Nucleic acid binder design. Structure first.
Lengths: 237, 77, 84, 72, 92, 73, 44, 82, 65, 73, 75, 170
RNA sequence: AUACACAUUUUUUGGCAGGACGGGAAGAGGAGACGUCGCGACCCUCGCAGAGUCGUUCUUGACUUGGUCGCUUGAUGUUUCUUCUUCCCGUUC
């Protein structure tokens, strides 16, 4: 039925069929979106971590959330994370997840889901707080919020997706960050052999000619023997 | 019917003013006296002047070590 | 394996003649010859064929076929082709 | 010492080579010659619209720079 | 003996800039022939000025239908050919 | 014979300027050292593009190949 | 989960590439199934 | 020596076509070919990138300046198949 | 490169012209001899049949199968 | 005339190198009261991943050693 | 290092074409392994039309690396 | 029997005479990118494993009914369709740069069936229909010329402005 | 069973600078050189062989040395100068 199904056309070698997610590329692009080099792969991952939090990526942004380069980057990255997510978990109903997230976005996120006992209610689209829910509601009809929600809608939504999908992939994020630190602390020979391993895993048959089928489990006289005359094997003819 | 290195050597002895045509550059050419050279045709050239053709003006440079790679055509003036 | 054709409209350029000949004779079997060696046109083209049965079948079936205005005359070559 | 040997170590590595002509190359190094002639497989190539190529060999002197994985 | 003299000449010669760069792990900026510049730390070098550079930030200049804009990106692990080097500057 | 190498050795520890083949850049600085292949090291360098001061670069290395000529200043 | 068993028998652990593979295969299978279920609903 | 150098030395006495780094094409009988690709050529018909064509008696171009040569197909037989 | 022998190969020249031909032999300088080699420029348009050619390794950019 | 060789293969992880001295004292007290003597002792690590070992080795170790690093480790 | 077999060209008037679309005419004097050439009675043919006798007897030298090609005016 | 990728992998694959490249299709039957000859091809399909490297396709001597089911192949320049039973042509063929089509000895009956050949933009220079019943029908030549003026040579005869104008007159 | 591949000819460089789209035709206010390879033909020309000879043996080693006219609106680069409307046929939403 699926004889021409090939995973290597879906996963890159650095992803190792869902083990890791390749973020170096985004360090190149994302890192450049800063117009400098003060940013290391690990500091970039440190930046990504913000998006595991429900508020950090919103109130402690790497860059100004109204910056062009930044919003574009965030779009590309978000898309990547999502495709990776569903790619690594075929068995789960993609449409179900999508709709769940969308409804969470409409019913909570855009409805003052972020609340502070001090500043009140934050708005993703206008990046401002609000004293009470009352002024918050009468602000959702104002020309300002109409403008913003009408221009920055796709970006806000993509940001949100990056957020929730990165949350669902926390284990993979950690796994990769770990990988990074390891490879980084390698030597030359070490790094080389490791790469060899990732490569072999990548270009290897999914089933070996040497696999199991139906192997189910349930639930003294040392100097004395030389002295005796066995230093020279004797024979009777 | 003499090797070019000996030609350059007679430029050295005669101390004649020398005009060099550079590589891939028609616009400027350099001029001055050859006080010495090496195997790589790098030349110490004294009272050298840059001569843009584009009446001709020029910039006095004084003593110069010109690398031989630029050299296209060495002449006397 | 090689067939000698003549009586062809020489006004056709060399490369178009060769492409149309390969086209026409591919129906009987693989044509091995890439290009006319003779570089004189005037019909005198040789067509080399991997199997011999395709050469015979082409010979019998395409005798006097109208090709670029003229009925081609087809015969077996006198000698074996260098590539054979 | 000789960095070309350091490139010789780089077999089966996925890299992005910028070239003096401006061309971008992306692929897994199969080998690099001491000339720094680089043979790669599974290469997407962008001339200054990407062409996908099974194998690509590059003359070493044309190579501008090669960007290696940060994991290296 | 010959090897010794080569390393020494390298040490007291103009190369001393890139040698100093690797030992101090100091940033240096490289004007290239592509009219791009690379500020980075020198991980390794070669007689040809082949280099391994870390924490690369390349700056460049692009022209558009309005004012010229400078563009820059970060490349953490960068290996560079030796003929692309116009100039290597070492600065505070 | 006075060779470019001895002239250049005498030029070491002196204020120089170097015009590259491109002429897009000239460098004026103290000549610290030069090697057998004639790569150039300058200090306190100043960059003159189109004959105007671009800026003060400082300790600088010049690839031999780019050098059109060197003059003493 | 740990012993990789469903009832009594603990099954051999498989490598990641195969698990994922079969998961995508099962994916297309479920696609087929959903299609057939559809046409059937439209015929019955 | 290079095997292609060996072929090019076999090409002597034949008619060859040369394209130089400038783009001009020189067709004619190759007198002599050095190891450095410096070639001496006879009765050359030259076609410029502009399309202008000239005739010249004896021409000798530096190896380094040659983009590529085309040599007759007679040589293709051997012995470079090995 | 020895594996590529006898194959039909596509070389990209220094000037952007694309040459295609059988790879009969190479050398150290990467001078290549190409049998039945033809030239393509723009991508077919402006294709010419050169025949047997040497190419100089100084001009060659890259080759592909 | 002995052959020179490398003995330092340790790259201190960033998270470890960020630790202050008071932090390091505290970590040692918490790790069964580790006492050190001698100059220049590197800070203790608390995770197998802070040691920069290949993935192979990591998999292998874990496998080889189960649970937290011991104080001696 | 090989020496160019330029002896057949010695003491012959030749038209050298050189990089930058430059062209000079003169009698082949000497040469070396490097293909550097000495030319007597050298005459520069500018792109316009006129020509200037740069080295009537004083002779010039042309770096072989710049020599694109050389045409024999005589037989 | 069917043209399937398992067959795509291993036919006698080589270069045309014309130096046209390709990689042929024969595990046990019908072929592609070279010599698709004599293995009883009913319907063209599974051209994707051809994965584009083919200049030519020698379909001759199969049992092909129509010419559809062509994946997008940029490289394919020549189709040698001879000795099949092509009744119809698809229409959205449009494999850009299909310069040559060989319909010789097939069963295309009507002028209207030839209409889809007009879709071939300006590339179908060479077309040969000789050996079909449609050739016998009146004003066959002129209708092919007025329908697909892109053809430069028809039935190995060259178009010519004279019969172009006559095709305009009718 | 027993060192080297940065100083002139190659790789360490003289380089850098309903709406849209196509096509084809008509009507109104893209063309001129200079080359290089093609559709037709009133033409030329008329035939089996990289070619031509020999030594030795059932197959090899040596030695010599389409062209022309139209296009009745064929295809292509150097190089100077100065679009609209209508109809038809394809893609996309």
């Amino acid at each position: 039925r699926a004889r021409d199904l090939d995973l290597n056309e879906i996963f890159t070698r650095d992803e190792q069929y869902g083990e890791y997610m390749e973020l170096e590329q985004f360090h190149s692009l994302w890192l450049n979106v800063i117009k400098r080099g003060d940013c290391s792969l690990l500091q970039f991952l440190d930046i990504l971590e913000l998006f595991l939090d429900d508020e950090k990526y919103l109130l402690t942004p790497p860059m100004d959330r109204k910056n062009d380069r930044y919003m574009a980057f965030l779009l590309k990255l978000s898309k990547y994370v999502e495709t990776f997510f569903f790619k690594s978990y075929a068995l789960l109903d993609a449409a179900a997840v999508e709709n769940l997230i969308k409804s969470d976005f409409e019913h909570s996120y855009c409805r003052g889901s972020l609340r502070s006992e001090a500043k009140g209610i934050y708005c993703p689209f206008c990046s401002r707080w609000f004293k009470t829910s009352s002024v918050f509601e009468s602000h959702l009809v104002g020309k300002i919020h109409k403008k913003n929600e009408s221009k920055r809608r796709n970006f806000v939504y993509s940001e949100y997706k990056l957020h929730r999908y990165l949350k669902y992939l926390n284990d993979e994020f950690s796994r990769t960050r770990s990988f990074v630190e390891r490879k980084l602390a390698f030597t030359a020979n070490e790094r080389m052999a490791e790469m060899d391993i990732l490569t072999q895993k990548y270009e290897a048959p999914a089933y070996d000619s040497t696999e199991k089928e139906g192997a189910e489990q349930v639930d003294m006289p040392y100097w004395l023997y030389k002295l005796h005359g066995l230093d020279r094997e004797y024979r009777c003819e | 019917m003499v090797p070019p290195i000996n030609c350059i050597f007679n430029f050295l002895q005669q101390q004649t003013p020398v005009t060099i045509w550079l590589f891939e550059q028609i616009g400027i050419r350099i001029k001055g006296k050859i006080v010495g050279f090496d195997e790589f045709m790098n030349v110490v050239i004294d009272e050298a002047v840059e001569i843009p053709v584009n009446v001709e003006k020029g910039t006095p440079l004084g003593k110069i070590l010109l690398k031989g790679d630029n050299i296209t055509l060495i002449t006397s003036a | 394996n090689t067939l000698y054709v003549s009586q062809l409209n020489e006004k056709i350029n060399m490369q178009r003649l060769r492409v149309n000949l390969f086209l026409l004779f591919a129906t009987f079997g693989e044509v091995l010859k890439v290009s006319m060696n003779f570089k004189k046109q005037r019909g005198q083209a040789f067509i080399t064929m991997r199997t011999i049965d395709q050469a015979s079948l082409a010979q019998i079936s395409l005798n006097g076929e109208r090709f670029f205005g003229k009925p081609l005359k087809v015969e077996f070559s006198k000698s074996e082709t260098k590539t054979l | 010492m000789k960095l070309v040997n350091f490139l010789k170590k780089l077999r089966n590595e996925q890299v992005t080579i910028e070239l003096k002509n401006g061309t971008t190359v992306w692929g897994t190094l199969q080998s690099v010659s001491p000339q720094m002639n680089a043979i790669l497989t599974d290469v997407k190539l962008t001339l200054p619209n990407i062409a996908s190529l099974q194998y690509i060999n590059i003359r070493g002197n044309t190579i501008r720079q090669i960007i290696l994985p940060d994991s290296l | 003996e010959l090897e010794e003299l080569e390393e020494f000449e390298f040490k007291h010669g103009p190369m001393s800039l890139i040698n100093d760069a690797m030992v101090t792990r100091t940033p240096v900026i490289i004007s290239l022939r592509n009219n791009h510049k690379i500020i980075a730390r020198v991980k390794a070098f070669d007689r040809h000025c082949n280099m391994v550079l870390e924490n690369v930030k390349e700056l460049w200049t692009e022209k558009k239908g309005k004012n010229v804009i400078n563009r820059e990106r970060f490349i953490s692990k960068l290996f560079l050919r030796g003929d692309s080097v116009i100039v290597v500057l070492k600065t505070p | 014979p006075v060779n470019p190498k001895p002239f250049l050795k005498g030029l070491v520890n002196h204020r120089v300027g170097v015009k590259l083949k491109f002429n897009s850049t000239e460098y004026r600085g103290t000549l610290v050292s030069t090697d057998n292949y004639f790569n150039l090291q300058l200090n306190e360098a100043e960059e003159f593009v189109a004959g105007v001061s671009h800026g003060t670069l400082g300790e600088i290395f010049i690839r031999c190949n780019n050098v059109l000529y060197i003059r003493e200043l | 989960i740990a012993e990789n068993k469903i009832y009594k028998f603990k099954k051999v652990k498989r490598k990641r590439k195969q698990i994922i593979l079969q998961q995508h295969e099962i994916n297309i299978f479920l696609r087929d199934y959903q299609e057939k279920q559809q046409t059937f609903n439209k015929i019955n | 020596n290079g095997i292609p150098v060996k072929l090019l030395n076999e090409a002597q006495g034949h008619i060859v076509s040369l394209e130089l780094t400038t783009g001009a094409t020189y067709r004619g009988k190759l007198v002599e070919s050095e190891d450095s690709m410096n070639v001496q050529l006879r009765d050359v018909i030259a076609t410029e990138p502009q399309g202008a064509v000239t005739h010249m008696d004896q021409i000798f171009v530096r190896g380094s300046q040659i983009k590529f040569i085309v040599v007759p197909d007679l040589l293709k037989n051997a012995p470079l198949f090995k | 490169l020895a594996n590529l022998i006898d194959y039909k190969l596509r070389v990209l020249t220094q000037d952007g012209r694309v040459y295609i031909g059988q790879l009969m032999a190479f050398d150290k300088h990467m001078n290549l001899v190409l049998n039945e080699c033809i030239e393509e420029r723009v991508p077919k348009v402006e294709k010419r049949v050169l025949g047997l050619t040497i190419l100089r390794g100084e001009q060659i950019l890259s080759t592909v199968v | 005339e002995l052959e020179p060789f490398q003995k330092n293969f340790y790259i201190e992880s960033e998270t470890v190198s960020s630790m202050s001295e008071m932090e390091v004292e505290e970590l040692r007290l918490s790790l069964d009261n580790i006492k050190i003597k001698g100059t220049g002792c590197p800070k203790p690590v608390t995770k197998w991943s802070q040691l920069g070992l290949s993935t192979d080795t990591m998999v292998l170790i874990t496998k080889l050693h189960f649970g937290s690093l011991t104080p001696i480790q | 290092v090989s020496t160019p077999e330029l002896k057949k060209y010695m003491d012959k008037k030749i038209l050298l074409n050189i990089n930058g679309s430059r062209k000079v005419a003169g009698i082949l004097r000497g040469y070396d392994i490097f293909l550097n050439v000495v030319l007597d009675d050298a005459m520069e043919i500018n792109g316009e039309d006129p020509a200037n006798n740069h080295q009537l007897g004083l002779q010039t030298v042309i770096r072989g690396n710049s020599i694109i090609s050389l045409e024999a005016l005589d037989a | 029997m069917k043209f399937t990728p398992s067959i795509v992998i291993d036919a006698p694959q080589y270069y045309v005479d014309h130096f046209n490249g390709k990689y042929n299709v024969d595990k046990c039957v019908i072929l592609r990118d070279l010599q698709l000859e004599t293995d009883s091809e009913s319907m063209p399909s599974s051209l994707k494993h051809l994965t584009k490297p083919t200049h030519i396709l020698d379909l001759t001597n199969n049992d092909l009914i129509m010419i559809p089911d062509l994946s997008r192949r940029d490289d394919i320049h020549t189709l040698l369709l001879g000795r099949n039973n092509i009744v119809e042509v698809d229409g959205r063929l449009l494999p850009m740069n299909v310069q040559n089509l060989t319909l010789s000895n097939n069963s295309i009956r009507r002028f209207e069936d030839l209409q889809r050949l007009r879709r071939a933009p300006r590339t179908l220079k060479n077309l040969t229909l000789i050996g079909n019943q449609v050739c016998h029908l009146a004003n066959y030549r002129e209708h092919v010329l007025r329908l697909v003026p892109h053809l430069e040579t028809l039935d190995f005869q060259n178009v010519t402005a004279e019969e172009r104008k006559s095709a305009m007159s009718f």
